[PDB]
C-alpha cells in the first residue's frame, strides 16, 4: 500500500459500518474499490490481512449487523471479490465461515435486500471477480449458486441480466479447460433453447453468442456440432424467436475458419430465405463482409441486399415481400430504404466487396430515389406512382441517399456519371423545401463529387457559373446552420482550387466575396467564425472584392468581441498568414498586444504558437533578439508562464525550452537573458506542468482523508 493510508484504514473500517453516520457516497466507494484493485492486483493478498487485520472485521460485520445500507453491501461484496482472487487468500478468507456466508443464505441473499438492483449487481460482480482458480469452481459447484444465476438471468434489470449472462460464460470458460459445472450450464442452455417464449431463447442465444467467437478451443467446435440441430430448427416458428440474437449468433459463428469443418452455410441460406425484411439486411451484409464463403451464397446475399433498389428502379421511367413492404406504409418504406442505403454505403470501401461491382445501376438507383424524394420523378406503373407518393418530402431517405451518393465518388468512371450526379445535386441545392440537414449533406456530397474527376476541363466552368447563384442564395438563409455550411463549403473549394484560372474567373465574376465580407457581422457567433476563416482563406489567395483594410476588420473582431469563437478563429487566421510568409515586426507586435489580454485559454495558446512561428522565422543574433524584444515576447512569455491554467503554462514552457536551446547553442547581451532563462528550472517546471490537474486530488490518500472527514 503506502505508509500513509495505514493510519486511516481502521478509522475507515469504523466509519463505514457505523449505522448512525450519513449514508456513504457512491463516487467515493467506486473510486475506493478502484484503488483497492490497484493495490491488491500487483502483490499478495494475505500479507495485506496480516499487516492490517481490520478489513476482515468489516467482512464479518457484513453478516452480523443485519441493518446495513443497500449500497455498502455492494461495496463490501465486490471487495471480498477482488480480494478472494488468490489461492492463499481464497483460503485465508474462509477460516471462520465467511465466503460461503458472504454469498450464501448467511449473506445478503437471505435478507430483504434482494429487491434493490445494486445488491444483485454487486453480488454478480463479486462472484465474477473471484472465480478464476479451481477452488472457486469447487465452491460454485458444491454449495450451489448456479441455480441462483439461472434465476437472475430472467430479471427486469438489464444490467443484472447481462452481468449474469457474462458470469455464466466466464464460469463455463473457466470450467472447461465434461465436468459437472459446464455440463449443468450447457444442459440448462440447450433446455432453454427449446422453450416457446422470447426471454428464455434470447438469453440462451446471448450466452451462445458470448461463448462462440470469444474462445477458440477445439471443444467449442464439438459444442457447435452438438447444438446446430436446435438453432437450425428454430427457423420454423411463425413468430421467429426474436430474430435478432439469432442473426447475431449466426454472424458471429461464421467468422471462424474453425467452423468450416459444412452444415452452417445451409442454415445461413435458409435464414437469408426465411427471416423477415428487417433482419435479412444485417445478415446479408455480415455475410458479404466475410472473406470465405461459397460463391452461390454471396451471390444470393448481394441479391437480397440489392432487391429494394432494383424494385425502385423498376417502376420509374428510366419480388413479393420487398414490394409488399414498400407499399405497406410510409414508415416501413422509409426504414427499408434507409437501411438498404446505409448497408450499401458500408459495403463499398471494403476490398472484399463483390467483383464486379455495379457503378452505373447503383448511381441510377440513387438518383432515382433522390428525385422521387424531391418530386421530379416519372412514374411508370401504379406502384411507381404510389411510391412517389409515399416518398414525397421524406427526410431520412434523402439524408441516406445524399450520404450514399457522396460515398460513390472514389469509384472512377466515365464523365456521364459525374454529370448525372452533379446535375441532381444542383437540383437538390436549389429547392425551396430543403431542410438544413439535407442542405449540409448535399454540400458535402457536391464537394466530394467535384473533387473526384479526371486546367479545369470542358464541363466544369459552366457548372461553377450555375452553382454560384445558388451558393449566393444560401449565404442568406434564415438558419445559421445553412449559412455556416455554405461558408465552409466555399472555404473547402477555394482551398482545393485556389490557383486555377477558370475558378477564380467564375468566382470574382459573381457576388460571393462581398457577401462573405458582409457576413463578418452576423449575430450568431458560429457564422461569424466561419466567415472569418473563409475570408482569411480567400484573402491568402488574392481574391478580394489592398488586403490592409481587411486586416483591420479582423483585428477589430479580435479586439472587442463578445464571444470567443471569432477570437480564436482570427488568431488561427493570423498564424496562417504568418506561416505563409505573407511590415512584419509591427504585425507580430500588435497581434501579441491584442492577445496578451484575452480571457480565453485558446487565444493565448494560439498567440504562443504565433510567437513560435515568428521565432522560427527569426533564427547576427543581436538584430534577431532586438526584433524579438521590440515585438514584446518577453512580457507575454513571462506573464503566461506563471498562469492559472495548465495548457497555457505548458505551451509557454515549451516555447522557453525551444528558445533556451537555440540561444545556448548560438552562445542587451544574450548571456544575461540566457542566465535568466536558466534561472528557473524549466525541467522541473515542465515536469510539474505535464501532470494531470488532479495529481493532488485523485491521490487515494486524499480520498481516504475525505471519506473519513465526514
Amino acid at each position: 500500500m503506502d505508509p500513509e493510508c495505514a493510519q486511516l484504514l481502521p478509522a475507515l473500517c469504523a466509519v463505514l459500518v457505523d449505522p448512525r453516520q450519513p449514508v456513504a457516497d457512491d463516487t467515493c466507494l467506486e473510486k475506493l474499490l478502484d484503488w483497492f484493485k490497484t493495490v491488491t492486483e500487483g502483490e499478495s493478498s494475505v500479507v495485506l490481512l496480516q499487516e492490517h487485520p481490520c478489513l476482515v472485521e468489516l467482512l464479518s460485520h457484513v453478516l452480523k449487523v443485519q441493518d446495513l445500507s443497500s449500497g455498502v453491501l455492494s461495496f463490501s461484496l465486490r471487495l471480498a471479490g477482488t480480494f478472494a482472487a488468490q489461492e492463499n487468500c481464497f483460503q485465508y478468507l474462509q477460516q471462520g465461515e465467511l465466503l460461503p456466508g458472504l454469498f450464501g443464505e448467511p449473506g445478503p441473499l437471505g435478507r430483504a435486500t434482494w429487491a434493490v438492483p445494486t445488491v444483485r449487481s454487486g453480488w454478480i460482480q463479486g462472484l465474477r471477480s473471484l472465480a478464476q482458480h479451481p477452488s472457486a469452481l469447487r465452491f460454485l459447484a458444491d454449495h450451489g449458486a448456479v441455480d441462483t444465476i439461472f434465476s437472475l438471468q430472467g430479471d427486469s434489470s438489464l444490467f443484472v441480466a447481462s452481468a449474469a449472462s457474462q458470469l455464466l460464460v466466464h464460469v463455463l470458460a473457466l470450467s472447461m479447460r465434461w465436468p459437472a459445472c459446464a455440463q449443468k450450464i450447457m444442459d440448462h442452455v440447450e433446455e432453454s433453447l427449446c422453450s416457446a417464449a422470447t426471454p428464455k431463447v434470447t438469453q440462451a442465444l446471448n450466452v451462445l453468442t458470448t461463448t462462440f467467437g470469444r474462445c477458440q478451443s477445439p471443444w467449442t467446435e464439438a459444442l457447435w456440432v452438438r447444438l446446430s440441430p436446435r438453432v437450425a430448427c428454430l427457423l420454423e416458428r411463425d413468430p421467429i424467436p426474436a430474430a435478432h440474437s439469432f442473426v447475431d449468433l449466426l454472424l458471429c459463428v461464421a467468422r471462424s475458419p474453425v467452423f468450416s469443418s459444412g452444415s452452417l452455410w445451409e442454415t445461413v441460406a435458409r435464414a437469408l430465405s426465411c427471416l423477415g425484411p428487417t433482419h435479412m439486411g444485417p445478415l446479408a451484409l455480415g455475410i458479404l463482409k466475410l472473406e470465405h464463403c461459397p460463391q452461390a451464397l454471396r451471390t444470393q446475399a448481394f441479391q437480397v441486399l440489392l432487391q429494394p433498389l432494383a424494385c425502385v428502379l423498376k417502376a420509374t421511367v428510366q419480388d413479393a415481400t420487398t414490394v409488399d413492404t414498400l407499399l405497406a406504409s410510409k414508415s416501413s418504406c422509409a426504414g427499408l430504404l434507409c437501411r438498404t442505403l446505409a448497408h450499401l454505403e458500408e459495403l463499398q470501401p471494403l476490398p472484399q466487396r463483390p467483383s464486379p461491382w455495379p457503378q452505373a445501376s447503383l448511381l441510377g438507383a440513387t438518383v432515382t430515389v433522390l428525385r422521387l424524394c424531391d418530386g421530379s420523378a416519372a412514374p411508370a406503373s401504379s406502384v411507381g406512382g404510389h411510391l412517389c407518393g409515399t416518398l414525397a418530402g421524406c427526410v431520412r431517405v434523402q439524408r441516406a441517399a445524399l450520404d450514399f451518393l457522396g460515398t460513390l465518388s472514389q469509384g472512377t468512371g466515365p464523365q456521364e456519371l459525374v454529370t448525372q450526379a452533379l446535375a441532381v445535386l444542383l437540383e437538390c441545392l436549389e429547392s425551396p423545401g430543403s431542410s438544413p440537414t439535407v442542405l449540409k449533406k448535399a454540400f458535402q456530397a457536391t464537394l466530394r463529387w467535384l473533387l473526384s474527376s479526371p486546367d479545369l476541363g470542358p464541363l466544369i466552368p459552366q457548372f461553377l457559373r450555375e452553382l454560384f447563384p445558388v451558393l449566393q442564395k444560401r449565404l442568406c438563409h434564415p438558419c445559421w446552420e445553412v449559412r455556416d455550411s455554405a461558408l465552409e463549403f466555399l472555404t473547402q473549394l477555394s482551398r482545393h482550387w485556389g490557383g486555377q484560372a477558370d475558378f477564380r474567373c467564375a468566382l470574382l465574376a459573381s457576388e460571393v466575396p462581398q457577401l462573405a465580407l458582409q457576413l463578418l457581422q452576423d449575430p450568431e457567433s458560429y457564422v461569424r467564425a466561419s466567415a472569418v476563416t473563409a475570408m482569411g482563406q480567400l484573402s491568402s489567395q488574392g481574391l478580394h472584392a489592398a488586403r490592409q483594410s481587411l486586416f483591420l476588420e479582423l483585428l477589430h473582431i479580435l479586439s472587442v468581441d463578445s464571444e470567443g469563437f471569432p477570437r480564436r478563429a482570427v488568431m488561427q487566421v493570423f498564424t496562417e498568414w504568418l506561416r505563409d510568409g505573407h511590415d512584419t515586426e509591427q504585425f507580430v507586435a500588435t497581434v501579441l498586444q491584442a492577445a496578451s489580454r484575452d480571457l480565453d485559454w485558446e487565444v493565448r495558446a494560439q498567440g504562443l504558437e504565433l510567437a513560435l512561428v515568428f521565432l522560427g522565422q527569426t533564427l547576427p543574433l543581436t538584430e534577431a533578439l532586438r526584433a524579438l524584444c521590440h515585438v514584446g515576447l518577453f512580457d507575454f512569455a513571462f506573464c503566461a508562464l506563471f498562469d492559472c491554467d495548465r495548457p497555457v503554462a505548458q505551451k509557454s514552457c515549451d516555447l522557453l525550452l525551444f528558445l533556451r536551446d537555440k540561444i545556448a547553442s548560438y552562445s542587451q547581451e544574450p548571456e544575461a537573458v540566457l542566465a535568466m532563462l536558466r534561472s528557473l528550472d524549466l525541467e522541473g517546471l515542465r515536469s510539474t506542468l505535464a501532470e494531470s490537474s488532479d495529481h493532488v486530488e485523485k491521490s487515494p490518500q486524499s480520498l481516504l482523508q475525505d471519506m473519513l472527514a465526514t
Binding site: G375, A377, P432, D522
Partner: protein, 451 residues
C-alpha cells in the same frame, strides 16, 4: 337537400343549398382572375389578345336560381365577400347576411381599397369574335354575365345589412333549422359553418388551417356526427411547405437588398401581409439584416395596422406626398394590387422594371404570375414565384375525414382527380371512404338522403 353551384373557382365558391323551405347561400365570391385579361390603368401583349377597357369582374351564376328568393347568405372570410355589393343590390335580395366582426372589418378595408383603385384612376366579348380572337382571350368562359366595378354607395349599403356573430353562437330561422359558426384558424376570424336540423345535420368547411396558433385554431372536434359535409378551399399549389416558402421569400429579399437594389412586393393591404411581416421581422432580427426602410403603401394602411394591434414599417396613404422625402434606396415596398392590373404598383414597375438589380416577389397563391406579368415584358427585373398558402393540404384532409367520417362528402370537380399538370402524383385527391361526390358550375346536384 338540393344544391346549386353558382361558381366553379376552388377558393372562391358560391354554393346555394336548398332545403324543404329554407334556401341558404354560402360564400358569395368574386373571381378577379378574369381581370387578368385587360390592360393596366396608368392589343397584342407579347402576342396575347387583351381587351383594353375598364377592368371587369366575373359575377357568379345568377340565372340558375332567382336571387331574390334566396334566404340567408353566410360568409366564411374576407376573401369570399368582394362580390357582396352586386348580389345584395342589383337583384332585389331581401334576406339577412351573417358574419363575424373582423371578417366585416377586413372586408371593409379591402372593398375600400378596390373602389379607391378604380375611382382614383379616371369589343371582344362577342361569341364568334372571341372564338376567332387569339388565345387566351378565347380561353375565357361565360363572358356574358360579367359586370363593371361597383360603387362606394353599394359598399356602404351592403355593410348596412351584415350582422355580427360571435364565436360558436347559435341562430334560428323560420323552420327549426339552427345554424352555427365555428372558427377555423385560417385568418383573424375565419368560420366554418354547421346547418343542423331535426334529422339532417350538415357541416361546411371552407379554407381552414392547422399551422400557427395565434388565431383561434380549427375546432376539428365539434364537426363530428355530420351527415353531408360540403368542403371547399384546399391548397392552391400541390406541393410546398409554408416554412420553406417563407425561407425562400426572406432569402431572395436579403439577396436582392444586400446587392444594392430595391424589392417590390405586391400583396393585399390585409391578409397574408400579417404572416409575411411577422416572419420578416423574425428574419431581420435573426440574420442581422437591418438599416433598410420597409415602406408600406396602401390608402387603407392606417386602419389596417391599428386593427393588427387590436418603428420600422412606415405606412403611407399613397406615393405623392411624404414618400419623396423619406424614400431611401434600397427599400422593400409592399404595395399594389397583386393582379398588377391597377394601382401604384404600375408606377413602381414602370420605374424599376428596366434595371437588373431590382426584384419583384410574388406571394399570392391565387393570381398566376405568368399571365399577370406578361403585359410588361420585356422586363429586366428578376421575377420570382413564392406562393404562401397555409390552407389544408390533402394529407390533413384525409386525416380529418378519418377523424370525422360522415356519411357522404361533396366536393368540386378538381378534388377527386390529381391536378391537370401532375397526373402521376395520384395522392392529390379526396381519398375518402366512401368515395365522394362532385359538381361544377350550374350543376344541379341532389343527395336524397331522405330517411
Amino acid at each position: 337537400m338540393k344544391l346549386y353551384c353558382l361558381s366553379g373557382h376552388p377558393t372562391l365558391p358560391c354554393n346555394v343549398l336548398k332545403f324543404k323551405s329554407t334556401t341558404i347561400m354560402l360564400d358569395c365570391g368574386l373571381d378577379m382572375t378574369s381581370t387578368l385579361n385587360f390592360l393596366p390603368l396608368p392589343k397584342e401583349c407579347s402576342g396575347h389578345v387583351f381587351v383594353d377597357s375598364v377592368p371587369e369582374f366575373c359575377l357568379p351564376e345568377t340565372e340558375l336560381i332567382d336571387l331574390s328568393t334566396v334566404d340567408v347568405i353566410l360568409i366564411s372570410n374576407y376573401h369570399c365577400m368582394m362580390a357582396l355589393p352586386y348580389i345584395t343590390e342589383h337583384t332585389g335580395f331581401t334576406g339577412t347576411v351573417y358574419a363575424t366582426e373582423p371578417t366585416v372589418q377586413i372586408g371593409r378595408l379591402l372593398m375600400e381599397e378596390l373602389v379607391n383603385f378604380i375611382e382614383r384612376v379616371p369589343l371582344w366579348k362577342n361569341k364568334d369574335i372571341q372564338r376567332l380572337l387569339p388565345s387566351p382571350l378565347k380561353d375565357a368562359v361565360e363572358v356574358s354575365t360579367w359586370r363593371r366595378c361597383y360603387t362606394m354607395q353599394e359598399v356602404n349599403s351592403a355593410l348596412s345589412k351584415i350582422q355580427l356573430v360571435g364565436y360558436s353562437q347559435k341562430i334560428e330561422l323560420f323552420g327549426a333549422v339552427q345554424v352555427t359558426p365555428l372558427s377555423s384558424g385560417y385568418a383573424l376570424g375565419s368560420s366554418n359553418w354547421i346547418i343542423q336540423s331535426h334529422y339532417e345535420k350538415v357541416s361546411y368547411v371552407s379554407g381552414s388551417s392547422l399551422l400557427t396558433t395565434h388565431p383561434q385554431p380549427m375546432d376539428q372536434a365539434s364537426l363530428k356526427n355530420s351527415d353531408v359535409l360540403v368542403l371547399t378551399g384546399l391548397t392552391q399549389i400541390p406541393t410546398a411547405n409554408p416554412d420553406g416558402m417563407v425561407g425562400e421569400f426572406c432569402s431572395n429579399l436579403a439577396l436582392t437588398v444586400r446587392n444594392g437594389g430595391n424589392v417590390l412586393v405586391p400583396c393585399y393591404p390585409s391578409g397574408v401581409i400579417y404572416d409575411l411581416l411577422e416572419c420578416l421581422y423574425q428574419y431581420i432580427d435573426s440574420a442581422g439584416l437591418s438599416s433598410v426602410p420597409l415602406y408600406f403603401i396602401s390608402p387603407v394602411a392606417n386602419s389596417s395596422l391599428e386593427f393588427s394591434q387590436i418603428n420600422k414599417l412606415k405606412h403611407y396613404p399613397s406615393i405623392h406626398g411624404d414618400f419623396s422625402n423619406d424614400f431611401r434606396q434600397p427599400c422593400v415596398v409592399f404595395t399594389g394590387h397583386p393582379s398588377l392590373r391597377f394601382g401604384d404598383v404600375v408606377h413602381f414597375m414602370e420605374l424599376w422594371g428596366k434595371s437588373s438589380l431590382n426584384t419583384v416577389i410574388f406571394t399570392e397563391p391565387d393570381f398566376s404570375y405568368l399571365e399577370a406579368l406578361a403585359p410588361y415584358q420585356p422586363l429586366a427585373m428578376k421575377c420570382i414565384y413564392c406562393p404562401i398558402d397555409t390552407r389544408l393540404n390533402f394529407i390533413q384532409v384525409s386525416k380529418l375525414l378519418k377523424e370525422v367520417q360522415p356519411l357522404h362528402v361533396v366536393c368540386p370537380e378538381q378534388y377527386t382527380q390529381p391536378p391537370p399538370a401532375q397526373s402521376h402524383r395520384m395522392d392529390l385527391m379526396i381519398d375518402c371512404q366512401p368515395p365522394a361526390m362532385s359538381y361544377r358550375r350550374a350543376e344541379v346536384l341532389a343527395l336524397p338522403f331522405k330517411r
